[PDB]
Symmetry: D2
Subunit: 230 residues, 4 copies
């Protein structure tokens, strides 16, 4: 998977996802920094918060490059807070809109890039899908996003092979983790981008080291380490 | 099919299509005034003009009632000019998003409710799909919406079994025809609705007589007959 | 939902599902004895056992009447044991192929017509989907189809409002429950049909009374009452 | 796009399309000899003739690798004559099952790998889709597969940039053209394969030169230049 998020002044979905020369659209068929998966063609999703702060989502199980409706409508959807993803399905996982990021508890939008043994996660009746990412999202939501770091560190310990890159937002805050995959940040004059990989070659892009938490709010970018549990 | 259109102050797609108690969503599984088709479950479409007058469209080949994305996003899409439809596919026609109304030439959005023998329509290289409605739209667009009435009257003469209900918009104007199916109008304080059937029991709803052209602008509604 | 099953001599999926005058295809837009749901257009599925006894499935989240591929290929798929369904999705449930019956554990194909509070079913890591039917299917598979009756009676006690019509097959046997919705049986000279609705006006159709178990194998059809639970 | 055809003893769709190590399934995400298109994820289709000579088709607008129904059912579908394809949609063309090869007139199945300007093709009321391949298929069907070579050379003259690789079958015969994309042939003991690219490294694979017609029937493979 690849994901991207925005927090700042109103910005269109198209401008964040479709229009950049190396953005999410391009990453659906030609990602630049993706170790696992050669493409992300098993669906996509775009979540945003409207002027009333309500979480809304558009999701699909088809390749992003092929969706004429999204290409037509995305430029007219503007938001101060966005989380979007393109999916590379793990073999054996369902391919269906409910399995595409972002997931939601109604307050937070959440994307997962990676892989985790569902066997180390609690069983749940509150997941949006059976895909490992959805089971993980349900866990994260149940513990609360203020405990994201602890949740990820604990799951990382239970499954040493897991990749646990999270990117989440609630309308006025971004939260992200690096845990076995890539993340970069870009400060703009009017807001902040977090992304699996830079959507262009802006010298402003800065890479987030592995096993860290990123916390974006009130024009602050707060980066803290995730300490292994033992 | 059933379609609906709005011209006026900004209105959300949800408020026009999903939220009314007998609106397009309800009509996808339980239309009230539809002689042909017991439902409209073969897709749907919503076209609108943004604040810059650009026509934009969201189309599907699935039942409207099942689309979680549209239900989630539609309340946040507001427009001064909307044309939306739910589809009942004629047996033998393809079911695919390209075949769902509204069609567009970039300037006009256009929906067709009815049926026409493609044999009486010109072959075209400008159709969005192979369905009869797309071939008809191509003809209408080619002749110009300024000649919508003449186009429909001519096609109606060539195919006397055809039903030719059109509903179209360009961002500042609505155009529609009744030709063998239903249409009604509702004048609101902040705009005008044209619809295959009323989306509630507002006593302001008024039915458009058959074989007529409807022209909506600047808070005017002009109804004229389609002559031979 | 509506479902249908066949156990007998080879029969094409088309002949069972598409071709009868009021069969599953017609039931997708115009069911004749369905109290809950106007139609069944939220997907469909056809499972069958091939000549090696392998369960195979074709499933969709689109209306059966519009699927040209299935209309074209179904006449060429023949089987001695078939379970097929058309779906009416409960509001709030996902609409996606994984949520369409039949579900499978590799040995059994299973369809559910009805509705159940997922809150009274065990958590599971073995469900195909989050839809209530998939969670119920997982429970049924886990307890074993030989305990189908007890499983359904127990769930029925836990959710007094639940409808729990099951139709299942393993290649050599059909199992079914009536629990708040319709089922009929037709014995042909070459096999047995179980179906939510008769697919024609054959005078051999007979209706299964509510709260009963149906067991078809070795050309026997055995119908037994299911006692309610009061634990 | 990439396509493959079989003419011979009964073969399962899975054995031809899904199971080979570099076959159509793999080509949907990792084609080996494809100049135009990184992959073929914009749909797929499998057409075959049943025991009574009836042409049947299963088509999709989704990536082949993700279709669980086809993966489950394909091993149970056997045929003496198959034409299958994975689609790489030209930008601006519709993505929908009717736009996926193979197209059919009821007697012939037909797949197109390439691109042609629809302006050089006659308008038609008999096309399955508005995609260029469907308009081209309608023309080819109208002129007759017996004139396949003439039609393709004619269209190629009108659109000098067109790529016009056709692969077609009627249950007892394969016909194919190379016109700006790849094709190979494998002769098996029990039949013949034509394919955009070899589905394995069988030493029997041989490549068809460009601007040629291939005609497979009665266990004979005849390759002739298009002039
Ligand atoms: N590559 C990934 O990020 C995969 C995410 C998750 N396992 C899925 O199948 O969707
Ligand atoms: N009932 C109708 O309005 C059918 C419209 C058109 N013939 C179609 O197939 O979509
Ligand atoms: N009416 C029914 O049979 C519904 C079955 C199940 N609740 C579903 O959503 O698929
Ligand atoms: N690359 C190709 O073969 C494209 C074929 C055809 N132009 C299509 O869009 O399907």
């Amino acid at each position: 998977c690849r994901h991207v998020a925005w927090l700042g002044a109103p910005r269109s979905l198209a401008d964040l996802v479709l229009d950049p020369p190396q953005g999410l659209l391009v990453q659906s068929y030609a990602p630049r920094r993706q170790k696992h998966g050669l493409m992300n063609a098993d669906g996509w999703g775009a979540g945003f918060f409207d002027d009333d702060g309500v979480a809304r989502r558009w999701r699909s199980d088809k390749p992003l490059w092929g969706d004429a409706s999204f290409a037509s409508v995305a430029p007219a959807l503007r938001s101060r807070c966005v989380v979007a993803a393109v999916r590379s399905a793990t073999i054996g996982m369902p391919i269906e809109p409910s399995a595409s990021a972002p997931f939601s508890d109604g307050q937070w939008l959440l994307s997962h890039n990676g892989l985790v043994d569902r066997g180390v996660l609690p069983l749940t009746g509150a997941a949006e899908s059976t895909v490992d990412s959805a089971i993980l999202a349900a866990l994260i939501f149940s513990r609360g996003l203020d405990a994201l770091g602890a949740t990820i560190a604990e799951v990382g310990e239970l499954d040493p092979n897991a990749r646990l890159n999270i990117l989440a937002a609630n309308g006025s805050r971004l939260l992200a983790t690096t845990w076995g995959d890539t993340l970069s940040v870009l400060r703009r004059p009017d807001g902040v981008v977090l992304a699996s990989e830079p959507y262009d070659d802006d010298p402003g892009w800065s890479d987030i080291p592995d096993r860290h938490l990123v916390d974006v709010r009130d024009a602050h970018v707060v980066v803290t380490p995730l300490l292994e549990h033992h």
